[PDB]
């Protein structure tokens, strides 16, 4: 196991475990430092790391060392012996904590035993040279005050106190002649500057610290994890695998881009979690290869090492044994060393993916930041780590006896207040970007707050390089993962090979490169007149010295007046906020405005189903104006059009290389090897797809998801800025009152803030879900497809290359060049489905992805909608849509296809969509209105079939056809095999539900069936098992095509395609969502209109109509006349019969031209009696259950109700509406609903039953029943003349 030694700073120097060390960077000069051996090969020097720094640099100044850190200075830290000792005791406690668990102990053991090779790149393969600064460090033996005697020692890690910035922990390696042994396989003495008291702070963006905003949200780090993070770097450096490779470099061209140092992959490996995914597979293999290469050199050296020219006492064997074990080399029974691929693999993955900050945190139940790419907050001071009441070896801050184990409460700033102290901002220095307008006003923004957008140069272009294929060529996959449970249980991982003595010859060649550091401006001034996220967030703040503020919806005034604060909430919310009231009304007002705040914030849960968008936060644009001027116009509309892309501050230029060409190695007369070469080129092909995807994922996370993170953060701030402003206003108004009045005011500030903060949390959850959706959306629609294109391109090139290859070997292959000739087609036929969990195991990311793929609306691969007098694809896949002159469009999303040649729409689908899921899996939906047949043309109508929508490529595909009263769906596989399913509606119904009426169609295709649904109901099914591959991504042509009558036309609306089979539940739902409207519809399904002639239809008496009775002021009910001709194919009841009614608007006499009738509207139901416009009235004083309606000239009589409220009691789709007579627009006194009632009449000659246009109270209770009774006589529909219906 590991032994942690004990000592006090004042303990005597014994030249063994407590020495006067001459640090590597001292260049063998200057003073020595009292060093303590905390364990074998590991030293603690309780002093400030001054190497490469300036003395004054230890004081806070207008400069900074790192552009991404809220740096804290304190030159007094460690300036006394008691401070040094507390440092020592604290280091000893952290080490005990670390070893308190199997995982940390192994990290320590790996580090103790990972002794640097005795030499570096300059040392001859046959030598061991300990006389170099990265292997030996001197200790002064001589008595106090004389560098007369000094001895050398071997060491692995020397830990110092902090440098100028206390919270800037760093692990440093030794470079000599511009090279680093710790990066070339040898390893070398590692150094670290660490501070256990001043730790970093962070918060879970996709969460909330104890659901408290007006608190000290965020969490503070466990210094033991911070230490282990650094120890991991030490581990890497000791094993010499701390190599440099293509680094992630931030794009810094735009003022909104965050500036930061290049990030090496080793850094992201150390953090673990999602970070490794930012390193593409290409660069992963590059690093892997270089590390393997380094190990080969070391293993070669072990086979050639003969002597140590610097220390005659060094035992060659002892070391060859140690290094063999360190690098896990294998040895034959003869002593020859060689690299065992499997053991190298396990060791490499262990070091790079096993020991990660993320794995350790999870194992020690410590909370840490979600990613290297997260905003760093100000650091805090841990009062006393040595106090077991605050921090223990076993549990850190999350002590269970204090009930602080659960949810990392012990690290929760808003909970464990007694464990830390905020820091003096006067000692903090943060890099700031001063944004100045070319005039002027200037806003300071912390560089940490900007958008981190990785530059294109960050990603490898290795996919573009050629690849030779051979019978032995194998795949290459490096999983940025490693089972932590096996690393903890692995038996033969921890060296059971003796650690050599540390004493050796003293170092005489102090040649070494000492880094030189210097601060840089903490403020960078840039000029811009842009008012993006930064300016918008700023406009929502106010100076500390101002206490009387007012809200405003005007961004410009807000920026202008310090007492004016910008608010993106409603106009009403803003007015109420600035409302001043009496003391006696204050409480009420507070309850009101707080309530409003919550309502406004909760609008973040807005739905937009009609636009196929489940979630939308309508105020994001107003709040931040991030991306493409999202504050101007209507955000929701702009989002329906451009999607997630509009929110991005910057659209990145993706690196999507053309996959390199495969060069196959031939083998004349060699059947096996040629077959292998082929099968290997096929698997290598898969490595290319996976790699491409990984390259995509890496760019998404570092160029896109980053931006979406800043937006989440920006929203969190905006919401808090808003709550802070309202709280400021509340406080101000309250304190204006006298103490006497305040005493009687019933207000609870904590409860107020409580409700505000709660509203904020609900908003944040919504926003995070919305934004995550956007980020995944951008990945799947704006990035993956661009990769699929290149991959499909490469695939084709690879196909011809494999066929041609099998062709040239037509001989050598014998009777098989055909078998595989297809084996090549069936493989390059199925495209690799993208799966994020393959490139990362980050839980948040996977869930993000799974959630997205569980939402059926994300399966929409074409969604044609009306926008600015044109049709466009809003699915986000960017299909090109050509609408020709003969197509009529309206803002109701209706489009008309006529018999004109130019009446067509051409859609060029996105060829890079996994539409061809190999088993035919997709759906098509849309609304359609098919006109009635011409009576004098019924023969043609029933016999002539004409295509209306055609999607063909290579004589394969699908099409929607119509032959009279039948709508047909047809499939055609590559072999010309055709299958069809269809829906036919009756054309002999007295009243048809489908002829000339809008209805919803949905066709679904799966491996077995082709189903047709109408208005959500399954109508037909056809077995499509026999059918083979169907090419469905060809062009889509919308056009009447076949032998049609010149008068033939068709209306369509909401045409959509899904790359999956919709369930009946999805269909019914889509049916209900697209049927919904605030307005009533007419008999055809179009919006009901004011000032438009309409015949009336009654759903409870289909074949009935209303006619003013000759001698009475009543409407008698007559039977509709029928189709007169003798066609055997058709029958119907006349629709254009009875009185011609016309609906008039009751309110606002803005004249009488036309407009839309909305549910609940108060109207006048009139009709035309010759040249006069009469009206429908109800005698006011009837006592019976019902009465006949009174039909007479327009007049305002005191004895008749003349006002009707058009209603819609049905919750399900319907074109029926109801008409209600109320006492007046205000009373709840309902007189009854309009309907039909049967009366008995017995005269001197005639005895019969006759129906009359009536008003009945009976309907009042009937319309409330469920399910809605569509057969009720109070259900009416309005039929205006329509070219689609002639009789
Ligand atoms: Zn690091
Ligand atoms: Zn960052």
Swiss-Prot record:
Which residues are responsible for catalysis? 230
Q: Which residues bind D-galactose?
A: 1236-1237
SUPFAM superfamilies given for it? Answer: Clostridium neurotoxins, 'coiled-coil' domain, Concanavalin A-like lectins/glucanases, Metalloproteases ('zincins'), catalytic domain, STI-like
Region annotated Belt, chain positions: 477-528
Indicate the impact reported for residue 1259 to S.
Greatly decreased toxicity, heavy chain has decreased binding to synaptosomes and dramatic decrease in GT1b binding
What catalytic reaction does the record list?
Answer: Limited hydrolysis of proteins of the neuroexocytosis apparatus, synaptobrevins, SNAP25 or syntaxin. No detected action on small molecule substrates
Q: Where is this region: Translocation domain (TD)?
A: 440-853
Q: What is the effect of changing residue 1188 to E?
A: Greatly decreased binding of heavy chain to host SYT2, whole toxin about dramatically less toxic. Significantly decreased binding of heavy chain to host SYT1 and SYT2 independent of gangliosides; whole toxin significantly less toxic
- Give the required cofactors: Zn(2+)
The reported effect of residue 1237 to W is:
Greatly decreased toxicity, heavy chain has decreased binding to synaptosomes and dramatic decrease in GT1b binding
| The entry's keywords | Disulfide bond, Host cell membrane, Host cytoplasm, Host cytoplasmic vesicle, Host membrane, Host synapse, Hydrolase, Lipid-binding, Membrane, Metal-binding, Metalloprotease, Neurotoxin, Pharmaceutical, Protease, Secreted, Toxin, Transmembrane, Virulence, Zinc
Sites binding Zn(2+) sit at 229, 233, 267
Indicate which residues the UniProt annotation says bind a ganglioside GT1b (d18:1(4E)).
Answer: 1021, 1185-1186
What does the record note on quaternary structure? Heterodimer; disulfide-linked heterodimer of a light chain (LC) and a heavy chain (HC). At pH 4.4 in the presence of ganglioside GT1b may form trimers. Interacts with host receptor synaptotagmin-1 (SYT1); interaction is improved in the presence of gangliosides. Interacts with host receptor synaptotagmin-2 (SYT2). SYT2 interaction and toxin uptake do not require gangliosides but are improved in their presence. HC interacts with a complex including at least host synaptic vesicle glycoprotein 2 (SV2) and synaptotagmin-1 (SYT1); copurification does not depend on glycosylation of either protein.
**Record protein name field:** Botulinum neurotoxin type B
Q: Which taxonomic lineage is given here?
A: Bacteria, Bacillati, Bacillota, Clostridia, Eubacteriales
* Gene encoding the protein: botB
């Amino acid at each position: 196991p590991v032994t942690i030694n004990n000592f006090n700073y004042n303990d005597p120097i014994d030249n063994n475990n407590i020495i006067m060390m001459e640090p590597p960077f001292a260049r063998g000069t200057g003073r020595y430092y009292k060093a303590f051996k905390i364990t074998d090969r590991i030293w603690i020097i309780p002093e400030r790391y001054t190497f490469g720094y300036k003395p004054e640099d230890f004081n806070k100044s207008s400069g900074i060392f790192n552009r991404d850190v809220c740096e804290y200075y304190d030159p007094d830290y460690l300036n006394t012996n008691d401070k040094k000792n507390i440092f020592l005791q604290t280091m000893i406690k952290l080490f005990n904590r670390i070893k308190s668990k199997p995982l940390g102990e192994k990290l320590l053991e790996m580090i103790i035993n990972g002794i640097p090779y005795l030499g570096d790149r300059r040392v001859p393969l046959e030598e061991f040279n300990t006389n170099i600064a990265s292997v030996t460090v001197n200790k002064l033996i001589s008595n106090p005050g004389e560098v007369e005697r000094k001895k050398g020692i071997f060491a692995n890690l020397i830990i110092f106190g902090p440098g100028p910035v206390l919270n800037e922990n760093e692990t440093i390696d030794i470079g000599i002649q511009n090279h680093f042994a710790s990066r070339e396989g040898f390893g070398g003495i590692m150094q670290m500057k660490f501070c256990p008291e001043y730790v970093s702070v962070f918060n879970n963006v996709q969460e909330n610290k104890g659901a408290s905003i007006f608190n000290r949200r965020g969490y503070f780090s466990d210094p033991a994890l911070i230490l282990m993070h650094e120890l991991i770097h030490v581990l890497h450096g000791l094993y010499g695998i701390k190599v440099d490779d293509l680094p992630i470099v931030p794009n810094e061209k735009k003022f909104f881009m965050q500036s930061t140092d290049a990030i090496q992959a080793e850094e992201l490996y150390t953090f673990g979690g999602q970070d490794p995914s930012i390193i593409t597979p290409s660069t992963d293999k590059s690093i892997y290869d270089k590390v393997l290469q380094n190990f080969r050199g070391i293993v070669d050296r072990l086979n050639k090492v003969l002597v140590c020219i610097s220390d005659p006492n060094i035992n060659i064997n002892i070391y060859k044994n140690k290094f063999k074990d360190k690098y896990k080399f294998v040895e034959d029974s003869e002593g020859k060393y060689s690299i065992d691929v499997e053991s190298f693999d396990k060791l490499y993955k262990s070091l790079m993916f096993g020991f990660t900050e993320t794995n350790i945190a999870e194992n020690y139940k410590i909370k840490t930041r979600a990613s290297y790419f997260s905003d760093s907050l100000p650091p805090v001071k841990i009062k006393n780590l040595l106090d077991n009441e605050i921090y223990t070896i076993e549990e850190g801050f999350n002590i269970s006896d204090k009930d602080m184990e659960k949810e990392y409460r012990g690290q929760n700033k808003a909970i464990n207040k007694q464990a830390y102290e905020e820091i003096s901002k006067e000692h903090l220095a943060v890099y700031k970007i001063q944004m100045c307008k070319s005039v002027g006003i200037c806003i300071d923004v912390d560089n940490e707050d900007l958008f981190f957008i990785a530059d294109k140069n960050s990603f490898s272009d290795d996919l573009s390089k050629n690849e030779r294929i051979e019978y032995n060529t194998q795949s290459n996959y490096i999983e940025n993962d490693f089972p932590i449970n096996e690393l903890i249980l692995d038996t033969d991982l921890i060296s059971k090979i003796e650690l050599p003595s540390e004493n050796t010859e003293s170092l005489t060649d102090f040649n070494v490169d000492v880094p030189v550091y210097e601060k840089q401006p903490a403020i960078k001034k840039i000029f811009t007149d842009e008012n993006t996220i930064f300016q918008y967030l700023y406009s929502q703040t106010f100076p500390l010295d101002i206490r009387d503020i007012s809200l405003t919806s005007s961004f410009d005034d807000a920026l202008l007046f310090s007492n004016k604060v910008y608010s993106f909430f409603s106009m009403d919310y803003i007015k109420t906020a600035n409302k001043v009231v009496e003391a006696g009304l204050f409480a009420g007002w507070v309850k009101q405005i707080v309530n409003d705040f919550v309502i406004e914030a909760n609008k973040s849960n807005t739905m937009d189903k009609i636009a196929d968008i489940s979630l939308i936060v309508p105020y994001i644009g107003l709040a931040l104006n991030v991306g493409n001027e999202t504050a101007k116009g209507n955000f929701e509309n702009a989002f329906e059009i451009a999607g997630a892309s509009i929110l991005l501050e910057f659209i990145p230029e993706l690196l999507i290389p053309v996959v390199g060409a495969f060069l196959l190695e031939s083998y004349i007369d060699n059947k096996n090897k040629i077959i292998k070469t082929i099968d290997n080129a096929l698997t290598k092909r898969n490595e290319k797809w996976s790699d491409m995807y990984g390259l995509i994922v890496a760019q998404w996370l570092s160029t896109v998801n980053t931006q979406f993170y800043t937006i989440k953060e920006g929203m969190y701030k905006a919401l808090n800025y808003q709550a802070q402003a309202l709280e400021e206003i509340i406080k101000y108004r309250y304190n204006i009152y006298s103490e006497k009045e305040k005493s009687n005011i019933n207000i609870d500030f904590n409860d107020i803030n409580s409700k505000l903060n709660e509203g904020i949390n609900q908003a944040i959850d919504n926003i995070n879900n919305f934004i995550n959706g956007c980020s995944v959306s951008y990945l799947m629609k704006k990035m993956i497809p661009l990769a699929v294109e290149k991959l499909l391109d490469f695939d084709n090139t690879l196909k011809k290359n494999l066929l041609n290859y099998i062709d040239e070997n037509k001989l050598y292959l014998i009777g098989s060049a055909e078998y595989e000739k297809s084996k090549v087609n069936k493989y390059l036929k199925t495209i690799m489905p993208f799966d994020l969990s393959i490139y990362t195991n980050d839980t948040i990311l996977i869930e993000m992805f799974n959630k997205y793929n569980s939402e059926i609306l994300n399966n929409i691969i074409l969604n044609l909608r009306y926008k600015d007098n044109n049709l466009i694809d809003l699915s986000g896949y960017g299909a090109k849509v050509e609408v020709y002159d003969g197509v009529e469009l309206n803002d109701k999303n209706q489009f008309k296809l006529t018999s004109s040649a130019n009446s067509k729409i051409r859609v060029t689908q996105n060829q890079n969509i996994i539409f061809n899921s190999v088993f035919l899996d997709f759906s098509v939906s849309f609304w359609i209105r098919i006109p009635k047949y011409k009576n004098d043309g019924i023969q043609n109508y029933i016999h002539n079939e004409y295509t209306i929508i055609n999607c063909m490529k290579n004589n394969s595909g699908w099409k929607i056809s119509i032959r009279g009263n039948r709508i047909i769906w047809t499939l055609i596989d590559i072999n010309g095999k055709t299958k069809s399913v269809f829906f036919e509606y009756n054309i002999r119904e007295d009243i048809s539900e489908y002829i000339n009426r809008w209805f919803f169609v949905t066709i679904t295709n799966n491996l077995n069936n082709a189903k047709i649904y109408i208005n959500g109901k399954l109508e037909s099914n056809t077995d499509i098992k026999d059918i083979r591959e169907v090419i469905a991504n060809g062009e889509i042509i919308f056009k009447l095509d076949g032998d049609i009558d010149r008068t033939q036309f068709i209306w369509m609306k909401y045409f959509s395609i899904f790359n999956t089979e919709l369930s009946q539940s999805n269909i019914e739902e889509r049916y209900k969502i697209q049927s919904y409207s605030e307005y009533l519809k007419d008999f055809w399904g179009n919006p009901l209109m004011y000032n438009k002639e309409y015949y009336m239809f009654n759903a409870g008496n289909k074949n009935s109509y209303i006619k003013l009775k000759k001698d009475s002021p009543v409407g008698e009910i007559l039977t509709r006349s029928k189709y007169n001709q003798n066609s055997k194919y058709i029958n119907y009841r006349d629709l254009y019969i009875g009185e011609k009614f016309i609906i008039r608007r009751k309110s606002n006499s803005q004249s009488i031209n036309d407009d839309i009738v909305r549910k609940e509207d108060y109207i006048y139901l009139d009709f035309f009696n010759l040249n006069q416009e009469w009206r429908v009235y109800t005698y006011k004083y009837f006592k019976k259950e019902e009465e006949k309606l009174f039909l007479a000239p327009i007049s305002d009589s005191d004895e008749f109700y003349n006002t009707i409220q058009i209603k819609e009691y049905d919750e399900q789709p319907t074109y029926s509406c109801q008409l209600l007579f109320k006492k007046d627009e205000e009373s709840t006194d309902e007189i009854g609903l309009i309907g039909i009632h049967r009366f008995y009449e017995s005269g001197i000659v005639f005895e019969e039953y006759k129906d009359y246009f009536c008003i009945s109270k009976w309907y009042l209770k009937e319309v409330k029943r469920k399910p809605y009774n569509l057969k009720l006589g109070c259900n009416w529909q309005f039929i205006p003349k329509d070219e689609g219906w002639t009789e």
